[PDB]
Write a protein that binds this ligand. Structure first.
Ligand SMILES: Nc1ncnc2c1ncn2[C@@H]1O[C@H](COP(=O)(O)OP(=O)(O)NP(=O)(O)O)[C@@H](O)[C@H]1O
Ligand SMILES: Nc1ncnc2c1ncn2[C@@H]1O[C@H](COP(=O)(O)OP(=O)(O)NP(=O)(O)O)[C@@H](O)[C@H]1O
Ligand SMILES: CC(=O)N[C@H]1[C@@H]2OC[C@@H](O2)[C@@H](O)[C@@H]1O[C@H](C)C(=O)O
Ligand SMILES: CC(=O)N[C@H]1[C@@H]2OC[C@@H](O2)[C@@H](O)[C@@H]1O[C@H](C)C(=O)O
Lengths: 362, 363
């Protein structure tokens, strides 16, 4: 059977649409990227902070989100010369607008009934909430998929997503899959360069690379309680955001903006490397996915901070780093429909294995 | 002959209805259980029915408590019936409407079905309205398909009329597609007015209304609302009919006695039902009344007088308790989802066509 996966992550760069075949293997068949319209991007970011009239605002924003998703699905199908009927189901994450696992809730918008109506394909959606209901963080969910791809008897591996947020899957032989969110990935580097220069992101980490790390600031940032925590943990824009950074910056006289950028890159690399090696000290291979894999400067620093391990993108292993998250949700649709568990209890802290998501039939 | 639970909490927020049916060749009400709505939860839910601050966080927390209460209701029914959760195929859960905006193409029912599934250990089918809305429909009312299944009769033009917080009718005309719509306020304003004035949750038997005098001028002004003039598919809710709405009209006429305003509100519900029902189904022979309005003696008497051509009676007279019809309908829709039989009526909702309604959250 073939499955579509739809992901729109933290970074709000665009929508990912993937087509896989699931048999004994998971094979990527096709992909399609649609950049996020600037208006829709702003309207989603506006829902990530508490504000007024959120029920109505969210209901309208998610109509536009779903329409874009359905358009992307249509475009992939046309490109591949396939009918919808050839696809078993779409696995749709939706869009996170609030993540408060401490308060036992997570909010992904993306009106699945409307996605089913527009695409003519069954939709499996709302994957995180059964994990949270069972006492879990609800995140990260990719570890079960990372296992399916890269679980190796002889090799101690970390599979590292660097999206807006970073998260790692620890694949240790003869051990439960573990993992967690490491902290910020691209989110603060993207925020800072956009705040300062109106750029979307820091191309190849060049701006960061042109600056010097500021020790006082780095120490300030790394002392956030999130970094000290071990075991299951998940985060989001609730914690790591421009106001948070500004608060730290206020405690010292002004710095060059590129030094701040440089420190933000070091924050990402340090929080990742230290949480990864704290959990899996005998790691021999770090398999990097997400768009952070294209930040040359970041990838260099990760290799330096983890000299024991080979740091490489998943491309080496036949999986494009950009499409890993899309692939995961396609996979999760399959897991739903076969009634196999989608969470990893030692990742999320949930009471046990759970079937994740909900079916909206065409 | 599988068994389904139905879980419903309507706009009146009086409480939570849990039903158990068997769905063989026909629908059989096996059991029911009623939970009063805790006062704090009722207020928290109402607070979400009007635009306000921090709604995403407030709704997420409120629904935790709604689901916990629903789950305890399910447990209590199963304990009373000496049943295991494994004996139930699925729960059909409407959730709780907090916003209904058909003209903006959205409707919002809270009630975290994944948590409901976790807590009950029973498969949940929820989120019934949004596929109909997706297909261009009102999303409401959804009972007509169930009403047709229960009471469809090729000999008799019947109307099945729910009088809850809001009123809605199912028009079962022999040889014709099922039609229907919300009629207007049911109990919502009579409840709101007596609570506003005296702190009562409802006007028992419509005795307070009956003591007052209908104000014909005020009545005409209320019935002049554009909603009442619309025909075909239409749906409404607290967004339209609420205390501010009444008060804008009250600031037309002099300082009326509160009992006269209550009498007027009763007549408003009676006239809006009678006028819309008769307009759509002049041939109506029987009006079968369900929902809590069936228990308002004064209202039922007025409906009878305003529709002298039809036999007006509660569904009790036809072997379904008026109180439990809605819960039964959602249990039935869980069934329809599983069998992939359509849940909507396009000539009711205005949708493009028949649709499978709801979403499955497996235990
Ligand atoms: N050439 C590059 N140099 C530096 N950073 C890059 C480059 N290309 C992409 N990025 C970063 O990667 C980010 C987007 O990665 P992505 O993995 O799509 O994030 P996401 O949206 O949070 N996750 P997803 O759901 O997988 O799309 C951008 O915002 C940039 O910060
Ligand atoms: N004895 C009675 N006399 C008068 N009114 C009554 C009586 N018993 C119940 N009611 C009314 O019935 C209402 C509740 O009916 P119910 O059928 O539970 O509505 P609901 O389902 O919550 N609303 P909705 O979702 O709009 O259909 C109460 O708020 C009262 O107004
Ligand atoms: C609540 C939420 O949307 N978390 C995202 C986010 O983006 C990265 C990281 O934080 C991860 O934990 C999760 O996404 C990926 C797809 C996951 O669940 O594995
Ligand atoms: C949006 C919404 O929840 N509408 C309710 C309300 O309560 C009565 C009436 O207005 C009806 O249209 C509907 O409920 C019943 C259960 C229905 O869908 O038939």
């Amino acid at each position: 059977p073939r499955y579509l996966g739809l992901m729109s992550g933290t970074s709000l760069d665009g929508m990912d649409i993937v087509l896989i075949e699931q048999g004994d293997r998971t094979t990527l068949l096709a992909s399609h990227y649609l950049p996020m319209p600037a208006g829709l991007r702003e309207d989603i970011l506006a829902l990530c902070v508490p504000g007024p009239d959120e029920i109505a605002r969210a209901a309208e924003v998610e109509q536009r989100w779903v329409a874009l998703a359905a358009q992307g699905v249509r475009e992939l199908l046309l490109q591949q010369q396939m009918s919808p009927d050839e696809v078993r189901a779409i696995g749709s994450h939706g869009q996170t607008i609030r993540h408060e696992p401490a308060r036992h809730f997570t909010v992904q918008i993306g009106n699945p009934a409307l996605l089913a109506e527009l695409t003519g394909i069954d939709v499996v959606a709302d994957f995180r909430r059964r994990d949270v209901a069972a006492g879990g963080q609800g995140a990260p969910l990719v570890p079960a998929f990372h296992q399916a791809l890269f679980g190796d008897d002889d090799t101690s591996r970390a599979v590292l997503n660097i999206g807006g947020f970073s998260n790692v899957s620890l694949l240790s032989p003869g051990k439960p899959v573990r993992g967690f969110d490491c902290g910020p990935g691209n989110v603060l580097m993207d925020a800072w360069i956009h705040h300062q220069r109106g750029e979307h992101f820091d191309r190849d980490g060049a701006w960061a690379a042109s600056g010097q790390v500021n020790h006082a600031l780095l120490a300030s940032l790394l002392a956030d309680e999130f970094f000290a925590a071990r075991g299951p943990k998940s985060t989001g824009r609730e914690r790591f955001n421009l106001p948070w950074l500004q608060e730290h910056l206020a405690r010292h006289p002004a710095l060059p903006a590129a030094d701040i950028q440089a420190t933000l890159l070091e924050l990402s690399a340090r929080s990742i490397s230290e949480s990864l090696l704290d959990a899996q000290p005998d790691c021999e291979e770090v398999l990097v996915c997400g768009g952070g894999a294209f930040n040359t400067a970041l990838m260099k620093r990760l290799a330096m901070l983890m000299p024991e391990a080979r740091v490489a993108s998943t491309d080496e292993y036949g999986i494009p780093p950009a499409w890993m998250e899309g692939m995961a949700f396609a996979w999760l649709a399959h897991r739903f429909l076969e009634r196999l568990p989608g969470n990893c209890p030692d990742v999320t802290g949930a009471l046990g294995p759970r079937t994740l998501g909900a079916l909206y039939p065409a």
